[PDB]
Ligand binder design. Structure first.
Ligand code: CLA
Ligand code: CLA
Ligand code: CLA
Ligand code: CLA
Ligand code: CLA
Ligand code: LMG
Ligand code: LHG
Ligand code: KC2
Ligand code: II0
Ligand code: II0
Ligand code: II0
Ligand code: LMT
Lengths: 161, 175, 154, 174, 175, 42, 194, 74
């Protein structure tokens, strides 16, 4: 398929990975009686292993010669669930955390003792800030264009050279 | 009188325009220019008078260089495409010259043009003022009548597929 | 201080606009109460919205029943799509976009009607009770009240 | 001030004897909820449509226009509706009443503006309401007959569901 | 002062009624940070490019140039069917046209009106009313063409056809 | 509850430990009910 | 100065009997940490959603739109069967309604910036049913009570559809008691997993 | 495997560059020692005051980047 890779549902080495993984569990299950807790546990593991391999086979992942699923991250839309869509989810959460922490640091600057607010956090005000982060792209961009995100170069302390 | 006596008379409909019976229930002339709306009403009306004459004539007459459709609305589909395009551009040229190249609502009436007026009276039928006033009201009402009538003729000709006069002489209800 | 979730941007060191428009009281039928321009509710108030909704509901009736209706030998009418009409002058495009492209009921199998629901695709109304009563039932019907009676006699 | 129609209840504080068909009957306080001019226009509209509906049920049981019996046979009341939806009859009625209702929407919005009495379409081609007392007598009468026909229409159609007959043959049989 | 487009928000300070397509619409305040006149030149140039581009996505549905008569009516395939010498000539011609805009912006930025590249051969916009109507109409048709081309592009990605063909075949949703 | 004990629970190490224990706990629960999510399923 | 709902506790501050449905019920003192305006916005919003949702479960059991995609008597099955495109259309339309109806004041920090803004009052009165100020107090009270009742009722309906895989009134008319062998509660760590 | 090792090499190149660039650009001065150019390239420290100034010279950034160069070529 892409880059000479094989879809995991028809690669024979993925099938051998699944078979060897289940024989490894079955030889451990061969040392226990049926209704015992180790037998129940190992059967649950065998079912979980089979479920994982079956799901990966039908997901559109591309296995290599090794038979292990490979990730395509060049930007094509048929593989966006492997890097582009997890990446969009990450950047939303990371920008949320950054926007919320910045909002609390600016609130804490206007406090009676600004350094006491950072080792003893005002939890109602900080929870007020953690709730605001869901619309951080719009709030942060409006913050940028209104001249309130970036400070000018002459209010920043720098080294002599 | 008031056309719709239960409704209050629209505020912008003074009697100065001919054909004014105070009929504006939806609420136009409170949003749009009455000068533009009157120009659209006369243009629609004259096009539909010519259209009803064309529909009736083409049911009987056909130029020798052209084929003949089943119906005068099917006459559109047997005249060559280049001919339709030439007619379209000829009408466009007339629209350009008559309005002086000002066609938009914003500029069409910047020269103090009178709605419906293109300075067209070769036979001098509008020489007399009072006769002109009567012919203004006659024009607007015949235009309104031809608008409804053209709608009727075109849709019945599409539905039946049998003209106007042959339809009347061979009337066949919906079954 | 700041109580928390107070909502005033000056208690959270947030930049506010400083402009808080006066809140009016007039309402519109499919709109909201709020600050408008002068003259806005007089031209786009309840009168406008009701009349426009009425005209849209009237013009739905030709649109929902759109098609090429033609007579056969008798008066029987056949319905066809507007696609079958061919425009004669536009080169390689033979069939042309019509009112069926903005309202494609047929592809989704809707059978639209002027009332909005046709014979096909009619609203479905069923009976939950299933033809039995609240109490003292017999057969494949055993209510919550019957189980209250069943538990009390056991 | 107690209600004349429901004596243990108070007067409904939005209804006054200048209205037509007033009996002080608003126990649930609905005249306080909705605008009263809307309620009056809705009542007269419901009244006139139901008067036409009741007369149509009676007349349809008595006689039927030429040709209609072939297209709709044993069917009556709601049963004809579905058959006549297949033909173009019901759709044509919907179209023309909808056309009238667009202007009725404009009329109702003028009524809520306060420039028109509810139910006033000024329609008096023959002359009956020339005199003021006769106009009042007709106004009270038309609300009274419309109310009676509202309940009538209800009864007629529900009797059709129960028996399959309709108003006149339900009188004749059982 | 309040925005006209968005009645509950305050007016964006750096846009004004003087500008032809003004609606008071700047919710994220780009003009509070960037130059309003640079944004107008960019909006007008994007609009002209998208006006041509929307016409170009639709037009080879009707007729093709004889040379490219074999080329596809899906525009995104006809993009790759053209030879690189042809695309090089297109890029050079656009470059020649962009020399006048490279000279307008970056050198005499403050002299003139946004989008005024000295291209008025037919001497329109002489009449002031016509000039106003044409300015606002160019802006609004440019914005409409931007939205229209963006639509038509992604629709050509989903249904592997052109706009008109997609509509006619009723291929309106992902197959 | 006492305001000085609530002020102690607002100190940085307590909130840090509670917040990341809560964070760790819903990652653990999400991987219990939905294990082996190598890709966004689409 | 004791609470009326909970007679052995003190009356919580920020609860002064002005708001409709104010019976002094705040034992955990959420109103002392979270501003009461935000809490009343959230209570009215939750309640309105639930009022529609409870009615949604009951009506969806009885009345359906046409088509096989809408023939799901059990409401928890309607979630999966109803067309995804239209369900995400509902979600996007809800998001647009949330930003516009709140007038871009959505965050906890910015909502109520305008002193004119009232908790739960979004300006929604299309038919001007609240025009009469005599009816205002009991309307506010009965809206609050309908919202609370519907929160409790929808919670019950959803978890009774989970326990019994039946639509709610059909569950009432074809009732079956819990075996207790199935639907065991907890137990993930008692058996040490699996 | 080649993807992962190329990204590790990129990290090593950037980190070695960071110490060497920071050493070159802070060589003339910083906030701890703003007059660092008066003392030269290789000096031990500025003493225990101002919090401590061990490894503050530009030579010491050569010293610290030598470990990262060895790691990178490794
Ligand atoms: C929420 C506060 C906050 C914010 C908005 C930023 C923002 C930034 N940091 Mg800083 N940083 C922070 C906290 C924060 N930092 C803390 C707590 C530390 C100590 C570990 C650092 C240490 C640090 C270094 C060493 C570097 C940055 C860099 C950067 C920049 C790029 C993003 C990045 O590299 O992330 C990197 C983030 C980290 C290394 C640590 C983040 C730790 C957590 C996840 C964030 C703090 C959470 C905080 C407790 C929020 C509580 C909120 C609550 C009170 C409401 C950006 C300017 C880089 C830079 O200058 O690039 C130009 C860089 O090299 N940061
Ligand atoms: C029943 C037909 C009818 C009538 C009574 C009028 C009446 C009028 N037209 Mg209209 N007009 C009509 C059909 C008609 N028109 C049609 C079908 C066309 C298109 C071919 C035109 C094109 C036209 C133009 C371009 C103009 C008029 C103008 C006029 C006015 C000049 C008086 C005159 O010559 O009358 C015509 C008398 C007869 C046709 C009867 C014979 C008068 C109001 C002029 C005006 O000032 O309009 C307000 C003007 O500029 N008309
Ligand atoms: C004035 C405009 C107008 C026009 C152009 C039409 C056009 C049409 N109507 Mg509609 N209709 C109108 C007004 C109009 N109607 C009004 C105001 C009503 C009252 C609500 C109706 C009620 C109506 C019904 C119920 C039916 C039609 C039907 C038709 C179709 C008849 C086609 C045919 O072959 O009939 C040829 C028939 C004739 C030439 C005979 C006409 C004579 C009729 C039978 C006399 C009726 C008199 C009546 C009692 C007058 C009282 C008026 C009052 C109650 C409003 C056609 C599409 C029929 C249809 O769609 O069938 C497919 C159908 O069944 N129309
Ligand atoms: C929507 C109602 C309806 C329907 C379905 C029909 C249908 C029919 N009518 Mg009737 N008709 C109607 C209303 C209707 N008409 C009304 C309101 C009038 C006006 C009084 C007539 C007057 C009328 C006459 C006078 C005749 C028909 C005839 C016919 C039939 C044509 C063959 C046809 C089956 C003809 C027929 O065959 O009837 C016996 C006929 O002669 N109709
Ligand atoms: C941008 C406008 C737009 C467009 C082009 C579409 C297009 C489509 N939608 Mg819709 N949709 C929209 C906006 C839009 N949607 C919005 C804003 C919502 C949220 C309220 C929805 C919710 C929605 C649902 C839930 C469904 C669709 C469906 C469909 C598809 C089939 C439509 C059909 O067959 O109609 C012909 C059918 C009808 C006209 C029947 C109408 C049924 C009535 C009117 C429902 C009552 C509405 C109710 C009162 C809503 C009130 C809430 C609202 C005010 C917020 C089609 C792709 C369906 C789908 O995906 O099927 C494949 C589907 O199930 N949509
Ligand atoms: C302008 C608008 C006008 C609207 C007018 C209509 C609405 C007016 C308000 C109506 C409010 C509801 C009234 C009922 C309407 C339906 C009537 C009906 O037939 O119901 C339908 C059902 C019965 O349904 C019956 O089914 C039978 C077959 O099984 C029959 O054949 C009939 O179908 C039908 O009569 O009614 C009930 O289930 C009532 C249950 C009991 C309700 C309370 C009874 C009286 C109170 C004493 C109870 C004490 C209990 C103590 C504890 C006991 C614990 C076990
Ligand atoms: C205002 C809204 C009010 C919500 C009320 C909640 C109603 C339902 C609550 C449980 C009902 C009965 C439970 C019996 C069921 C029961 O007790 O099962 C027992 C289970 C532990 O299993 P065992 O050790 O009992 O195994 C026992 C053996 O018999 C079987 O193997 O207890 C739990 O830990 C499960 C709950 C998760 C604990 C963490 C929850 C998530 C934490 C989120 C942050 C805190 C929130 C509150 C946490 C408590
Ligand atoms: C001829 C063009 C035109 C048509 C065909 C048309 C049709 C309908 C229909 C048809 C189904 C409905 C239901 C409807 C309803 C509303 N229109 Mg109307 N409308 C048209 C023109 C304008 C303008 C120019 C404005 C406007 C407005 C509103 C408001 C909000 C008021 C508010 O909430 O305060 C509501 C509810 C104003 C606005 O704010 O729009 C965001 C505004 O300036 N409309 N409109
Ligand atoms: C400058 C100047 C003059 C000049 C000139 C020139 C060359 C002027 C050229 C003007 C042009 C080409 C304007 C074209 C605008 C196109 C638009 C607005 C299309 C929008 C498409 C839409 C909205 C759509 C869509 C679609 C979507 C997305 C989904 C589809 O499935 C379907 C659908 C089709 C509905 C001259 C030469 C006279 C001289 C003068 O002195 C100065
Ligand atoms: C915002 C928020 C709130 C909230 C909220 C909530 C939870 C709101 C939920 C709203 C919902 C559920 C809206 C549902 C809309 C359904 C539609 C439009 C159906 C269209 C059917 C169609 C097009 C069809 C079809 C057809 C197809 C295709 C093929 C046929 O075989 C079948 C069929 C014929 C039927 C509130 C107000 C409470 C408060 C606060 O302000 C915050
Ligand atoms: C405001 C406004 C207007 C409006 C509007 C609207 C849309 C008003 C609609 C309001 C609605 C839909 C209210 C619904 C309340 C539902 C309740 C109280 C259910 C409680 C359930 C319980 C207690 C239960 C239960 C159950 C459980 C758990 C166990 C089950 O086995 C069984 C059982 C069923 C018994 C309009 C738009 C007209 C305009 C106007 O200008 C302004
Ligand atoms: C006139 C529209 C104006 C703006 C429209 C622009 C839309 C903006 C982007 C929305 C994307 C369109 O949404 C896309 O189309 C339809 C909508 O159900 C869905 O398509 C799905 O449902 C349709 C409708 O029955 C089926 O015929 C089709 O087989 C199925 O794939 C796609 O899964 C979805 O990806």
């Amino acid at each position: 398929d892409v880059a000479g890779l094989t879809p995991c549902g028809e690669s024979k080495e993925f099938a051998r990975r699944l078979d060897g993984s289940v024989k490894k569990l079955q030889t451990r299950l061969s040392k226990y009686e049926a209704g015992t807790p180790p037998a129940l546990a190992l059967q649950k593991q065998i079912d979980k292993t089979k479920n994982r391999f079956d799901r990966y086979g039908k997901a559109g992942l591309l296995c290599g010669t090794d038979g292990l699923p490979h990730l395509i991250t060049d930007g094509r839309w048929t593989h966006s669930g492997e890097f582009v869509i997890p990446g969009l989810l990450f950047l939303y959460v990371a920008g949320w955390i950054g926007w919320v922490g910045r909002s609390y640091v600016l609130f804490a600057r206007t406090a009676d003792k600004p350094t006491e607010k950072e080792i003893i956090i005002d939890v109602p005000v900080a929870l007020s800030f953690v709730s605001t982060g869901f619309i951080w792209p719009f709030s942060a961009f409006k913050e940028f264009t209104s001249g309130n995100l970036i400070v000018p170069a002459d209010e920043i302390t720098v080294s002599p050279r | 009188d008031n056309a719709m006596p239960f409704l209050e008379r629209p505020p912008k409909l003074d009697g100065s325009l001919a054909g004014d019976v105070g009929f504006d229930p939806v609420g136009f002339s409170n949003y749009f220019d009455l000068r533009w709306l009157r120009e659209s009403e006369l243009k629609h009306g004259r096009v539909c008078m010519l259209g009803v004459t064309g529909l009736l004539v083409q049911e009987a007459v056909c130029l020798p260089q052209f084929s003949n459709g089943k119906t005068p609305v099917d006459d559109f589909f047997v005249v060559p495409a280049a001919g339709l395009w030439q007619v379209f551009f000829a009408i466009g040229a007339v629209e350009f010259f008559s309005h002086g190249f000002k066609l938009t609502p914003g500029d069409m009436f910047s020269e103090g043009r009178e709605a419906g007026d293109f300075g067209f009276d070769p036979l001098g039928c509008g020489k007399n003022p009072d006769a002109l006033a009567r012919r203004r009201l006659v024009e607007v009402k015949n235009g309104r009548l031809a608008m409804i009538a053209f709608g009727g003729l075109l849709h019945q000709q599409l539905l039946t597929g049998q003209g106007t006069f042959e339809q009347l002489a061979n009337f066949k209800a919906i079954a | 201080d700041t109580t928390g979730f107070s909502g005033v941007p000056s208690q959270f060191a947030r930049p506010e606009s400083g402009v808080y428009p006066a809140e009016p009281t007039e309402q519109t039928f499919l709109g909201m109460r709020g600050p408008r321009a002068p003259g806005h509710r007089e031209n786009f108030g309840g009168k406008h919205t009701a009349t426009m909704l009425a005209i849209a509901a009237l013009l739905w009736q030709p649109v929902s029943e759109a098609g090429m209706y033609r007579m056969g030998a008798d008066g029987a009418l056949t319905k066809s799509s507007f696609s079958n009409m061919e425009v004669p002058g536009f080169g390689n495009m033979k069939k042309a976009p019509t009112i069926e492209s903005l309202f494609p009921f047929a592809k989704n199998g809707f059978d639209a009607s002027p009332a909005l629901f046709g014979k096909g695709s009619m609203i479905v109304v069923e009976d939950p009770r299933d033809g039995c009563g609240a109490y003292a039932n017999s057969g494949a019907c055993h209510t919550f009240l019957d189980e209250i009676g069943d538990a009390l006699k056991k | 001030a107690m209600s004349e129609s429901v004596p243990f209840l108070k007067k409904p504080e939005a209804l006054d004897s200048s209205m037509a068909g007033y009996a002080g009957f608003d126990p649930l306080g609905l005249s306080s909820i909705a605008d009263i001019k809307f309620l009056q226009e809705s009542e007269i509209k419901h009244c006139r449509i139901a008067m036409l509906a009741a007369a149509g049920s009676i007349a349809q049981d008595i006689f039927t226009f030429p040709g209609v019996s072939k297209v709709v046979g044993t069917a009556k009341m709601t049963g004809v509706h579905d058959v006549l939806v297949k033909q173009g009859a019901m759709g044509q009625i919907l179209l023309w009443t909808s056309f009238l209702e667009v202007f009725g929407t404009i009329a109702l919005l003028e009524t809520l503006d306060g420039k028109r009495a509810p139910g006033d379409f000024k329609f008096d081609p023959l002359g009956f309401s020339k005199n003021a007392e006769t106009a009042k007598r007709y106004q009270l009468s038309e609300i009274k007959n419309g109310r009676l026909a509202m309940l009538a229409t209800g009864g007629m159609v529900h009797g059709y569901f129960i028996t399959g007959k309709g108003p006149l043959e339900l009188l004749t049989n059982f | 002062e309040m925005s006209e487009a968005i009645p509950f928000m305050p007016k964006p300070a750096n846009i004004d009624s003087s500008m032809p397509g003004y609606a008071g619409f700047d919710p994220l305040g780009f003009t509070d940070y960037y130059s309003a006149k640079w944004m107008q030149e960019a909006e007008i140039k994007h609009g002209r490019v998208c006006m041509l581009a929307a016409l170009g996505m639709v037009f080879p549905e009707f007729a093709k140039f004889p040379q490219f008569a074999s080329f596809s009516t899906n525009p995104l395939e006809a993009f790759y069917q053209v030879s690189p010498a042809g695309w090089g000539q297109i890029f050079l011609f656009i470059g020649v046209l962009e020399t006048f805009s490279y000279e307008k912006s970056f050198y005499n930025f403050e002299g003139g009106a946004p989008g005024a590249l000295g291209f008025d051969p037919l001497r329109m916009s002489s009449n002031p009313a016509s000039a106003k109507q044409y300015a606002a109409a160019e802006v609004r048709n440019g914005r409409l063409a931007m939205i229209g081309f963006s639509g038509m592009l992604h629709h050509a990605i989903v249904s592997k056809q052109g706009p008109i063909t997609q509509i006619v075949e009723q291929n309106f949703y992902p197959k | 509850m006492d305001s000085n004990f609530l002020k102690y629970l607002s100190t940085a190490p307590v909130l840090f430990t509670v917040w990341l224990s809560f964070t760790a706990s819903f990652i653990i629960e999400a991987n219990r009910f939905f294990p082996d999510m190598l890709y966004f399923p689409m | 100065a004791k609470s009326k709902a909970v007679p052995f506790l003190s009356q919580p501050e920020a609860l002064d009997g002005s708001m409709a449905g104010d019976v002094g019920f705040d034992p955990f003192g959420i109103s002392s940490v979270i501003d009461i305006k935000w809490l009343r916005e959230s209570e009215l919003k939750h309640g309105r959603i639930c009022m529609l949702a409870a009615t949604g479960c009951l009506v969806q059991e009885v009345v359906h739109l046409p088509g096989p995609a809408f023939s799901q008597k059990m409401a928890l099955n309607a979630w999966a069967a109803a067309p995804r495109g239209g369900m995400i259309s509902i979600l996007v339309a809800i998001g647009l309604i949330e930003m516009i109806s709140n007038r871009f004041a959505l965050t906890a920090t910015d909502m109520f910036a305008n002193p004119n803004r009232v908790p739960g009052d979004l300006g929604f009165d299309p038919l001007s049913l609240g025009a009469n100020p005599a009816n205002r107090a009991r309307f506010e009270l009965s809206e609050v009570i309908h919202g609370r009742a519907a929160m409790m009722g929808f919670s019950g309906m959803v978890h009774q559809m989970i326990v019994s895989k039946q639509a709610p009134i059909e569950q009432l008319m074809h009732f079956k008691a819990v075996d207790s062998s199935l639907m065991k509660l907890g137990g993930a760590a008692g058996n040490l997993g699996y | 495997g080649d993807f992962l090792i190329h990204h590790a090499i990129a990290l090593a190149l950037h980190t070695t560059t960071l110490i060497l660039v920071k050493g070159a650009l802070d060589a003339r001065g910083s906030k701890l020692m703003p007059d660092k150019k008066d003392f030269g390239y290789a000096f031990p420290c500025d003493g225990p005051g101002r919090g401590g100034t061990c490894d503050i010279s530009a030579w010491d950034a050569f010293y610290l980047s030598m470990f990262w160069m060895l790691n990178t070529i490794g």
